Design a protein around this ligand. Structure first.
Ligand code: HEC
Ligand code: HEC
Ligand code: HEC
Ligand code: HEC
Ligand SMILES: C/C=C(C)/C=C/C=C/[C@H](OC)[C@@H](C)[C@@H](OC)[C@@H](C)CCc1oc2c(O)c(OC)cc(OC)c2c(=O)c1C
Ligand SMILES: COC1=C(OC)C(=O)C(C/C=C(\C)CCC=C(C)C)=C(C)C1=O
Lengths: 75, 60, 49, 378, 241, 67, 49, 54, 54
């Protein structure tokens, strides 16, 4: 039930925009793009990766332990 | 004004009806040219193998 | 289920007290070499192997 | 005065899909809502064209499905689009829930609570669907999941036999499961509209969890085009699966006809049930195991009451970010265990993962939010 | 006895992503089915007309159908006669019952072969390994020898007698009927039996990949073109005094 | 007379280095079992170990000969 | 004092045929729309198939 | 729409499917029917506007 | 069941074997005719009272 012209109050803010036909869709796509993804990765790796390596270690150990347990030796 | 995207726009894209006409005429000739190509690629990557290449062994 | 002598040996000997559902083997059969059971698991209804 | 704006039908379309003020701001994680709609109509459309040739009798049900895959002109794409779309439906559901959990979108109580109903309804629908081709996984799937009701004390047995049609899964079970599986997606579709109706009341949340009224953009052309791209990725992901690996996400055992005398050695759920399966069997108790299963999905309705943080989103909350990912990886752990037999290392680590699932949501994530409040002097 | 062995990766001509079934090998593999397996194994979901596209001609498959006796629905006196049988006939059943299947094969039921590649983990690799890898028992274990030794079978004791060897019938084109090739061709046929769509889905797949290689960068450019206005926008804040 | 290429390949596979060790420990199992009074201790484990290394090598090679 | 507002430089984002402020955009107008509409025209053709 | 040269196996299975869904499609069109109606409210026996006495 | 061999048999299975299957079947049958009586009354009302001007 929310409409433009009724959302909120904003004062003293200028927005400059260009037409889509004046500008490139892929402005500096690799030159600026790659540096950004690396920066985004660095920012989040310590938050995202360590639970999944913790999954990976419990996976690797668990599969190994199950394999070894269904072998005998001195009996 | 020599440039080709310009003449493409001037003759075909400016009007939406002409734009639609150039898409539908475009889609007819694409369906032929793509199915021609994509079959010929699939047939060449499977050199004998299919019943189209076996066909001649069993007679007329 | 036809039961060997080693099979009946284990069932009479093991503890009635330590089961979840307390029964003797002798009150679960009539003649001790024949056990007749409905092959439906009491959990969620699969066939025990 | 616009025809788009004042026509009583187009009004509804315009205020939902065109002029709707949306944040400048919302990422790819917001694509899953439309993708769930695409999934819903894909499953409706293929499901309709499968219903045109399927017979719901025990003698003939397996035969009709294979008649579709061999004799029916292009019956094979329709059947495996349907099969892999159901798995696509689940990938999108899980992404969509996780987005909501991360970004604090659950603070929209009605939208979220309707979402929880939508999860349970699509789970029940897809259980029914898997019963229909009458393979081995179909039969025992039907056996186990219906029997969950038998854990309700005093009346549970009467209830299971009430939905079965008799003392066992039978002729009566399959014909009604076809009927239940036909209607329920349309009921889902109606609940999806109420879900959207409650949402439009607030508009969308965004990555920052900060109100975005200061910077709204029209849904068209920005999110119409971002949604088209997102759908074209969904078509890639789906059409990779049907055309290059149609059976990767299913079970080979469902290609042998149903057999009430033998349950297979290996039996596991469909991949998307494996975490909940792992939770229930970690408990060596009937009532507790099913109570944990119910609680594993119904917990989402407690998450709003347990939000301690003075911020909405997890974007500026690193302790919570870590514990969110521990939750995802623990869920990934539980689907791995679900896939494995009830033997030595797997019993314990699955028990610990079950405990961690409930400890993370109930205790550890609310405490993280308080610590984060205290660290910002809040 | 609970211990398992899993099949190795055989390089099937149809193992690759955009790769046909060998229809010359489907032919030879049907020949393995008709002569060896159809004595024991049902194939209820394949008919003679299915071969007409695939390996045989219309005339070849009609002459092959005209070899069995099939019961036909009633004459206008009310009795069940027999006929040469057409392309519409599904492949003929040994045994009227599962119980008559169990009775001839010493307790054990031979399952249908219409599904069998899609119905076992490993697919054709397993069926190849179960066929070509028939072997002698190790010391310590003996069979009640209605059942035989196979390592690839779960539990190691299989009811099936080792049904493939050097020169069980000849191949029509002239091909050496070594057990390896008899097993190769039948597994190539049983893949087609499980999945006749196989070659069509891979054809549409190449079309899907090539189309998506056009449409994904194009729709991306369309979306970027519109998002241009926002992505390059500049803000200034200009408060009073 | 009749030449199965699997016979040519299996012999060529068994002479490779992994198989030599796994045939060895199977043979050492072979002598152990006839020896004892009424041993249950199987050579299932050591046969399947050897077949694992053998059939892996068989699969890499066999189809290059067959038509 | 609103006369202090200049529109900031957009050269970083501009199409190459539109970087010269000394030269008319009307000349590159047919070409630039041409390229962008050809993209949507091909997509429609692609989707149509 | 038959599934072949005559009414057959194919005809009945799809007619069950078509007959199942169509009442729900009807139900949705009944809502749009009501939506257009509420725009004016009801007519009455006289055919005269009744805003004077709702 | 929507197969030609069994469709007649399932409907009569409803009317004889299914607990109260007979009321459900004939409620359905006569409700379809009720649906038509109501439709025709509803159209005729609309025709008479000029409700078609909506
Ligand atoms: C009589 C001996 C035969 C012949 C000539 C063949 N089969 Fe089959 N088969 C037979 C039996 C008794 C069984 C049941 C085994 C048991 O459960 O104890 C089977 C089963 C198979 C299977 C399934 C094995 C499995 O569970 O994984 C397959 C894949 C199979 N048979 C294939 C097969 C092929 C390819 C044949 C021609 C070479 C063949 N069979 C013939 C009995 C017999
Ligand atoms: C248990 C939670 C939950 C489930 C399951 C769920 N939703 Fe939502 N959905 C939400 C919440 C919360 C939002 C608001 C997200 C926001 O603004 O950040 C939402 C937003 C959406 C949106 C629009 C914005 C967006 O996120 O893309 C659509 C469309 C959507 N839901 C439809 C569906 C459909 C269709 C289903 C499957 C039937 C479904 N949802 C399942 C809770 C969920
Ligand atoms: C118009 C009826 C119809 C609708 C709508 C429907 N389906 Fe189905 N579905 C079927 C039929 C018939 C089958 C049996 C054919 C088959 O097994 O593929 C089936 C099969 C399935 C299967 C088993 C797939 C397999 O073959 O292994 C699943 C899972 C499934 N449906 C889930 C869904 C989901 C999720 C939805 C959307 C909420 C849905 N279906 C919509 C009729 C429907
Ligand atoms: C071909 C004409 C026609 C058909 C058929 C028809 N409607 Fe209507 N309906 C109308 C008109 C016109 C009105 C307005 C009557 C008035 O205000 O006098 C209306 C009014 C109604 C009303 C509310 C006022 C009233 O008259 O009771 C309901 C409810 C209704 N329609 C539902 C239905 C349902 C349900 C169906 C069956 C699916 C249906 N209609 C079939 C034309 C029709
Ligand atoms: C008319 C009555 C109806 C429709 C009742 C519906 C109840 C529906 C449920 O809630 C919506 C349910 C689907 C949901 O539980 C929360 C799932 C996640 C349960 C996951 C599930 O799957 C299994 C499965 O798939 C199997 O087959 C391959 C076999 C199984 O045992 C071995 C299971 C199983 O043990 C469990 C817990
Ligand atoms: C304010 O956020 C919204 C979005 O932005 C992320 C959307 O993308 C969509 C688009 C949703 C579609 C196409 C599914 C429709 C479902 C049914 C059952 C017809 C809606 C409605 C929405 O409200």
């Amino acid at each position: 039930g929310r409409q433009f012209g009724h959302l909120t109050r904003v004062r003293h803010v200028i927005t400059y925009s260009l037409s889509p036909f004046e500008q490139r869709a892929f402005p500096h796509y690799f030159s600026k793009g790659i540096p950004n993804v690396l920066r985004r990765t660095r920012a989040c790796i310590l938050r995202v990766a360590p639970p999944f390596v913790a999954f990976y270690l419990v996976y690797t150990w668990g599969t190994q332990e199950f394999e070894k347990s269904k072998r005998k030796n001195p009996a | 004004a020599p440039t080709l995207t310009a003449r493409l726009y001037s003759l075909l894209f400016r009007r939406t009806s002409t734009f639609a006409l150039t898409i539908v005429v475009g889609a007819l000739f694409f369906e032929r040219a793509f199915d021609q190509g994509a079959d010929a690629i699939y047939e060449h990557i499977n050199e004998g193998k299919l019943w189209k290449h076996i066909k001649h062994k069993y007679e007329n | 289920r036809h039961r060997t002598k080693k099979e009946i040996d284990q069932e009479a000997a093991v503890e009635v007290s330590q089961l979840r559902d307390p029964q003797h083997d002798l009150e679960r059969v009539k003649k001790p070499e024949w056990v007749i059971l409905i092959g439906v698991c009491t959990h969620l209804g699969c066939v025990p192997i | 005065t616009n025809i788009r704006k004042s026509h009583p039908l187009m009004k509804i379309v315009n205020n939902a899909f065109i002029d709707l003020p949306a944040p400048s701001n919302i990422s790819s994680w917001w694509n899953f809502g439309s993708l769930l709609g695409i999934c819903l109509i894909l499953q409706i459309l293929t499901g309709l064209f499968l219903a045109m040739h399927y017979t719901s009798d025990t003698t003939t049900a397996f035969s009709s499905v294979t008649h579709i895959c061999r004799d029916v002109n292009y019956g094979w794409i329709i059947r495996y689009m349907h099969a892999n779309g159901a798995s696509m439906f689940f990938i999108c559901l899980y992404m969509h829930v996780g987005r909501g959990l991360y970004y604090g979108s659950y603070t929209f109580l009605e939208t979220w609570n309707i979402g929880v109903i939508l999860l349970l309804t699509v789970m029940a629908t897809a259980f029914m669907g898997y019963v229909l081709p009458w393979g081995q996984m179909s039969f025992w799937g039907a056996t186990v999941i219906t029997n969950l009701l038998s854990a309700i004390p005093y009346i549970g047995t009467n209830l299971v036999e009430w939905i079965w049609g008799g003392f066992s899964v039978d002729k009566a079970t399959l014909t009604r499961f076809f009927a239940f599986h036909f209607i329920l997606p349309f009921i889902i579709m109606a609940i999806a509209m109420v879900h959207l109706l409650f949402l439009h009341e607030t508009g969308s949340n965004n990555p920052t969890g900060i109100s975005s009224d200061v910077d709204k953009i029209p849904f068209h052309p920005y999110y119409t085009i971002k949604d088209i791209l997102g759908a074209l990725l969904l078509i890639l992901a789906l059409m990779l699966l049907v055309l290059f690996a149609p059976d990767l996400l299913g079970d080979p055992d469902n290609y042998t006809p149903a057999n009430p005398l033998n349950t297979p050695p290996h039996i596991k759920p469909e991949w998307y049930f494996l975490f909940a399966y792992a939770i229930l069997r970690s408990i060596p108790n009937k009532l507790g195991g099913v109570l944990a299963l119910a609680f594993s999905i119904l917990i989402l309705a407690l998450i709003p009451l347990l939000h301690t943080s003075k911020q909405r989103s997890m974007m500026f909350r690193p302790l919570s970010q870590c514990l969110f990912w521990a939750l995802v990886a623990d869920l990934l752990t539980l689907t791995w265990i679900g896939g494995q037999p009830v033997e030595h290392p797997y019993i314990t680590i699955g028990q610990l993962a079950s405990v961690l699932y409930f400890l993370l949501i109930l205790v550890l994530m609310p405490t993280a939010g308080t610590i984060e409040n205290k660290l910002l002097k809040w | 006895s609970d211990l398992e062995l899993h099949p190795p990766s055989y390089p099937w001509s149809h193992r690759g992503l955009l790769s046909s079934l060998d229809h010359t090998s489907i032919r030879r593999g049907f020949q393995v089915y008709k002569q060896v397996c159809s004595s024991c194994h049902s194939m209820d979901y394949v008919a003679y007309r299915h071969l007409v596209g695939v390996c045989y001609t219309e005339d070849e498959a009609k002459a092959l159908a005209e070899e069995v006796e099939v019961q036909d629905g009633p004459n206008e006196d009310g009795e069940m006669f027999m006929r040469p049988g057409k392309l519409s006939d599904y492949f003929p059943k040994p045994y009227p019952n599962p119980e008559a299947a169990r009775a001839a094969n010493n307790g054990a039921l031979p399952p249908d072969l219409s599904y069998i590649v899609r119905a076992r983990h490993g697919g054709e690799d397993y069926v190849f390994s179960l066929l070509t890898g028939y072997c002698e028992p190790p010391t310590g274990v003996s069979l009640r020898e209605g059942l035989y030794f196979n390592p690839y079978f779960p539990g190691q004791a299989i009811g099936m007698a080792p049904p493939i060897y050097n020169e069980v019938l000849e191949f029509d084109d002239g091909t050496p009927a070594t057990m390896s090739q008899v097993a190769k061709d039948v597994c190539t046929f049983l893949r087609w039996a499980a999945e006749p769509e196989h070659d069509h889905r891979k054809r549409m797949g190449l079309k899907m990949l090539l189309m998506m290689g056009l449409l994904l960068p194009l729709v991306y450019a369309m979306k970027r073109h519109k998002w241009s206005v926002l992505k390059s926008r500049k803000l200034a804040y200009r408060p009073p005094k | 007379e009749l030449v199965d290429p699997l016979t040519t390949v299996r012999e060529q596979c068994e002479q490779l280095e992994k198989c030599v060790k796994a045939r060895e420990r199977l043979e050492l199992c072979d002598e152990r079992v006839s020896s004892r009074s009424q041993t249950e201790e199987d050579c299932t484990e050591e046969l399947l170990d050897f077949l694992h290394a053998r059939d892996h090598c068989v699969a890499h090679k066999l189809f290059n000969s067959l038509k | 004092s609103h006369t202090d507002i200049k529109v900031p430089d957009f050269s970083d984002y501009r199409r190459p045929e539109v970087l010269d402020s000394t030269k008319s955009s009307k000349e590159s107008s047919e070409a630039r729309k041409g390229f962008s509409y050809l993209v949507t025209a091909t997509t429609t053709v692609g989707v149509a198939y």
